[PDB]
Structure formats: C-alpha cells, structure tokens
Write a protein that holds these residues in place. Sequence first.
Motif, PDB file in Angstrom:
ATOM      1  N   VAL B  18      -1.833  27.030  11.853  1.00  0.00           N
ATOM      2  CA  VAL B  18      -1.750  27.256  13.298  1.00  0.00           C
ATOM      3  C   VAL B  18      -1.982  28.710  13.676  1.00  0.00           C
ATOM      4  CG1 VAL B  18      -0.552  25.138  13.973  1.00  0.00           C
ATOM      5  CG2 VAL B  18       0.803  27.155  13.313  1.00  0.00           C
ATOM      6  N   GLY B  19      -1.516  29.629  12.836  1.00  0.00           N
ATOM      7  CA  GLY B  19      -1.669  31.059  13.068  1.00  0.00           C
ATOM      8  C   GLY B  19      -1.656  31.886  11.802  1.00  0.00           C
ATOM      9  N   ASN B  20      -1.475  33.209  11.967  1.00  0.00           N
ATOM     10  CA  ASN B  20      -1.384  34.185  10.879  1.00  0.00           C
ATOM     11  C   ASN B  20      -0.655  35.440  11.329  1.00  0.00           C
ATOM     12  OD1 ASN B  20      -3.889  35.851  11.880  1.00  0.00           O
ATOM     13  ND2 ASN B  20      -4.790  33.869  11.343  1.00  0.00           N
ATOM     14  N   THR B 101      -4.160  33.096  23.755  1.00  0.00           N
ATOM     15  CA  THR B 101      -5.557  33.283  23.341  1.00  0.00           C
ATOM     16  C   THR B 101      -6.270  31.917  23.301  1.00  0.00           C
ATOM     17  OG1 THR B 101      -5.044  35.262  22.049  1.00  0.00           O
ATOM     18  CG2 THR B 101      -7.156  34.196  21.530  1.00  0.00           C
ATOM     19  N   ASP B 102      -5.633  30.891  22.673  1.00  0.00           N
ATOM     20  CA  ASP B 102      -6.194  29.538  22.604  1.00  0.00           C
ATOM     21  C   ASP B 102      -6.328  28.990  24.016  1.00  0.00           C
ATOM     22  OD1 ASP B 102      -6.094  29.661  19.717  1.00  0.00           O
ATOM     23  OD2 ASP B 102      -4.077  28.711  19.684  1.00  0.00           O
ATOM     24  N   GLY B 143      -2.393  38.282  22.588  1.00  0.00           N
ATOM     25  CA  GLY B 143      -2.473  36.874  22.945  1.00  0.00           C
ATOM     26  C   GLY B 143      -2.069  35.916  21.848  1.00  0.00           C
ATOM     27  N   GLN B 144      -2.357  36.265  20.586  1.00  0.00           N
ATOM     28  CA  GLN B 144      -2.026  35.456  19.407  1.00  0.00           C
ATOM     29  C   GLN B 144      -0.522  35.440  19.105  1.00  0.00           C
ATOM     30  OE1 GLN B 144      -4.160  32.800  18.439  1.00  0.00           O
ATOM     31  NE2 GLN B 144      -5.614  34.505  18.419  1.00  0.00           N
ATOM     32  N   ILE B 282      -1.850  22.064  29.661  1.00  0.00           N
ATOM     33  CA  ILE B 282      -1.490  21.855  28.259  1.00  0.00           C
ATOM     34  C   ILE B 282      -1.419  20.367  27.859  1.00  0.00           C
ATOM     35  CG2 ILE B 282      -0.498  24.217  28.166  1.00  0.00           C
ATOM     36  CD1 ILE B 282       1.822  21.518  27.185  1.00  0.00           C
ATOM     37  N   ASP B 283      -0.908  19.508  28.776  1.00  0.00           N
ATOM     38  CA  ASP B 283      -0.813  18.056  28.593  1.00  0.00           C
ATOM     39  C   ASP B 283      -2.201  17.405  28.725  1.00  0.00           C
ATOM     40  OD1 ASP B 283       2.010  18.419  28.401  1.00  0.00           O
ATOM     41  OD2 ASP B 283       2.448  16.716  29.720  1.00  0.00           O
TER      42      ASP B 283
END
Lengths: 302, 287
Positions: B18-20, B101-102, B143-144, B282-283
Amino acid sequence: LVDIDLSSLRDPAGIFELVEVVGNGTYGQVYKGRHVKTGQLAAIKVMDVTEDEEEEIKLEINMLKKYSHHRNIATYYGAFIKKSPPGHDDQLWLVMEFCGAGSITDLVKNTKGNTLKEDWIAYISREILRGLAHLHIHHVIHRDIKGQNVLLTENAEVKLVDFGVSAQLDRTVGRRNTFIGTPYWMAPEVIACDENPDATYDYRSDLWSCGITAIEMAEGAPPLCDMHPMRALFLIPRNPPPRLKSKKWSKKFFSFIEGCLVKNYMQRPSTEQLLKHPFIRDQPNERQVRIQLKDHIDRTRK
Amino acid sequence: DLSSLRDPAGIFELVEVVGNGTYGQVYKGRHVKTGQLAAIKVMDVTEDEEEEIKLEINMLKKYSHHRNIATYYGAFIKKSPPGHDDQLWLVMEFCGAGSITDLVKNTKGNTLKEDWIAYISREILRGLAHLHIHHVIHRDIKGQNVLLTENAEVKLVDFGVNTFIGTPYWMAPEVIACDENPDATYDYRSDLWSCGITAIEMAEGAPPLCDMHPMRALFLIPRNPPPRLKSKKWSKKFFSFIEGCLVKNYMQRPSTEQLLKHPFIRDQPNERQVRIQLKDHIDRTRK
Ligand SMILES: c1cncc(Nc2ncnn3cccc23)c1
C-alpha cells in the motif's frame, strides 16, 4: 545460458527457482536460487510489486543496455514476475550470478581491527577497476560502487553486483527512485552546487567511489560515515579529497587514493590510467593474496 | 523489551503493498482471526537498530492518540531463518481511502476542489499542532503521508523519522545544507513548509519541481522564489495561505497556531458538505 532473455519480463517457471524458503514481505532481499536447466546456483533479489509497477518494469527492461560478460561482474540473468491472483501482489525477481563468500564490507567487518592488509586492498581494487573498465568501454556507469556492491566467490574471485545496473532496476521498485540514496561514496560532480547545477554522472564518478571503497577496506567505513547524510552531501564538494587516517600505509597506496579522489572529474584519471598506477599494476604477491583470502573465506564458513 | 514481541503467524497476513515509509515496505494486513484490516510497516531488524525501533515504537504509542494521527495497534517480530535479518512488523490503523496523492491522481484533471484543500490542510495542521505541543517534528509531511479513512477522516503517518536522504520535493530550505545554512536545521516550522507543498500537490497533482532529478530539486529549493500555484482560478485566500506556509526563512514563517487562524483554514462554512463530498468520492472509487 540458453534460456536468458534480458529484454523481456517472464514467468520464472522452468528457468529459475528459489532454493531458500522465501516468506511474506519482500523488498529487495537476496535469496539463494538455482538455474533449472543447468542446476547452476543463482542470487535472486525478490520484491513485492503492484500491478502498475509491473507495466513500468516492462519499459525499463526495454531500455537495458547490453554488454558481454566479464570475470569481474556478477552476470545479470534477467527479470522475472512470479504471479499471484489479482488483489494480492506479484513478486519481481532480479537474477544474478551467485557469489558465495559475501561482500567486501562483510569481509572487513569480519576482519580483526576492521582493516584489510594493503596487498588485499590492491588486489580487490584492481578487480573492481577491471570490472569498471568493462562497463565503461560499453558506455555503462555503475553508479553504486561501494564495499556492499563488491562480492567474493568461494574461490576469492572479485565480482561487481549487477542486478541490472544499466537501468538501475533494484533502486526503483518501492518508489526508492524519487529518493537520494546514501551519499558517502558520491563523487563531487554527482551533487548539485553553484558551479555544478546539473549534477551529472560521468564514468569517472565510479573511480571516485572506487577510492572511497579502498578507504572503506582500509578503515572499515567510508570517510564521512555516521554524519547526517545531508551534511555529508554539503561537505563532499567542499572538503579536501579524503585521505587515509593511519601513517602505516605505503606511499603507493596514498598515491592511488590521490588518483581516485581528484575532486574535479575533468582532471580525474580514467579507469585505464588507474590500472597503470603502481599500487594496482605492481602486485608480486597476487598468487598469495588469493590463497590468503580463500583461507579467510573457509575459516569464517564455520 | 524487544524479546517480548511475538511471531505474527496465525495473527496477521500481508495482503498487498500500500505504501513505503522507507525503511521497509507498508502492507494492507488482514487480521487472521477477525478479518479486520491494518497497515503493516515491515522492516528488517539489523539490531544494530535496538534503540532506534524501541524509540520509534515508544513515540508511536505515545503520540498516535489524536484524531489526526493514524493509531498504533502493536508490534510483531517475524523470526527469519539464518543468513537473513528478522522482520519488525508495526501494526497501524488501516486508512481505507488511501493517501491524498492517490486521491488527486484518481481525480479528473489531477486537481482537488478548493474547499477540499482547505479541509485537508486544516486537519494536517491540527495533527501537526498535536505533535508540536509534544515537542515532536513530523519531518516528512507530504501527500503520501496524509491519509484518508473511509469516513473521510484525515490522518498523519510516518512521524518523527538513517544514512540515506528521502525524496526532496517537500523539504523546507532550512533542512537543505548550503553556504549560509551548513547545519541543515529541523524546526517545528519545517512541517509547515511541507504542509504548503502538500496543498500545491492537492491543487496540481504533483509538488513543484516533480520533473527535476532529486539532486537538482535539492539545489533549487533554497534558491528559487517561494513556489506558487500555476492556475489563476484559485481564490486570493488560497494564494495567501500558500504565502504563509512558504516563507523561505523559517525564522519569519508563521507557527502552526497562526496558520490555523488564517482565513483559508479558519473560514470553512461548507465543512459538513466537504466530508460528505469526500466520502462520496472514496466510495465511488470502487472498480
Ligand atoms: C506508516 C508509514 N508509511 C506509510 C503508511 N501508509 C499507510 N498506513 C495506513 N493505512 N494506509 C492505507 C494506504 C496506505 C497506508 C503507514
């Protein structure tokens, strides 16, 4: 090897397999593997990748510059994707020639006093330079010469890590690309400043890094270790060329370091010129050094 | 004690990246016994580390208790076979809607509506105000690292965090060393500059200089004038908010409390609707 395709992203089934049991959660760790068709051992770098990153990986592979193999480079065998069902992430495999004895950094860490004998430094430095000479003539810059990227085989052969250098495949997976890595082995020209705003690599940048690796072999750590990376970045273009701390080293070794560590890359000698340096060119105990390194390998393997 | 940390087998399973938060990767984790989601920051424990992760876990449990910071659940050690380092698993609140960001990359035209930027920016500032009062600097606002829960709640991740330099685009001039600034200072106000860069990122889909090689961006940040929004469509209050965040000299940059009183942040009459509108987006993003 017969089934190697460096231009495509393929399933590894029937080509390579892992030998070590690889668990959940990979991000660049290296596992023992094997070439299925020959039984020859291989080093496999494994990373969990998104479906989007796979599409990107495909383009990066097309950009891979090609070069024949060389005794001082751990042969890059390609990129593979081991599929998982949609939703669950797949794994990217970067495959390389297996080098059993570990890195030059581990060797120095395992050595008493974290210092290698001078004739060992000369031997290792020459093999690095020969590896670099091969990449440079093929218009490839390594970009990450350091002790951790210089490996030893069981027979004390010296090999440069190549998991796809000509397209920096191992430093792009988990967005590690937007990041500036570790700065300690960086040449002044790779760091932007008033006189150098377009921080551009040159083949000669590898030579500065080779000199930093020789100091790393001599002292167990690069000159600016433990300093916050941003401060090391400020100091590299400003500080005088790094020099060996101890007075025990020969004049030829101090001279070799002066050659590698010319701050202005335009005045820094080429790989071919450094290969002619007396510290590299004159190695009468070359047969014995290999024997001595081979014994250090077999004695730490217990 | 670090030895008290159990194995995650039969407790958590890693689903997808999902991230880092580099060191290591971030995974959407599924609690084996309950089916409940969690974010798992996986990292190799060199140890070495010992004190490093001990103080990360210490500050995770100490400061995760604010509505604008993703809550820390616990930690696990995945014992690795010989020849490999053990893995540390930090289990955090899973923010279902992903990063801002996404959100912007998934939005048409890679631009968020101004009242959404005001709402998100205020929640970031409230999260920062909590860290700052506890004498903690985030150091990596971008943003991340700003997430949205399914209920459109805004949460900060990866706070208070080492021989490598991360991405430079959100870095304040004082964190970059140069002739006049050899020490490369981190102040509470460095987060405020990063917050302003995040507001530009929400407005344009990318931070200023996203084009540039990171080394060149690093050279340009202390030299270039304060970044400014490219489009003329934005309100004067938004341009004014950016001017506040983006004062190059941190000594002259307003505090978190002053920025919370800025009209762009302070005056939000459509606050109820923005949350509804964000929850809707988002939904809707389900394909
Ligand atoms: C800690 C440190 N660096 C990154 C994260 N990323 C996330 N954490 C929580 N939920 N989530 C959903 C999508 C991404 C994330 C956490």
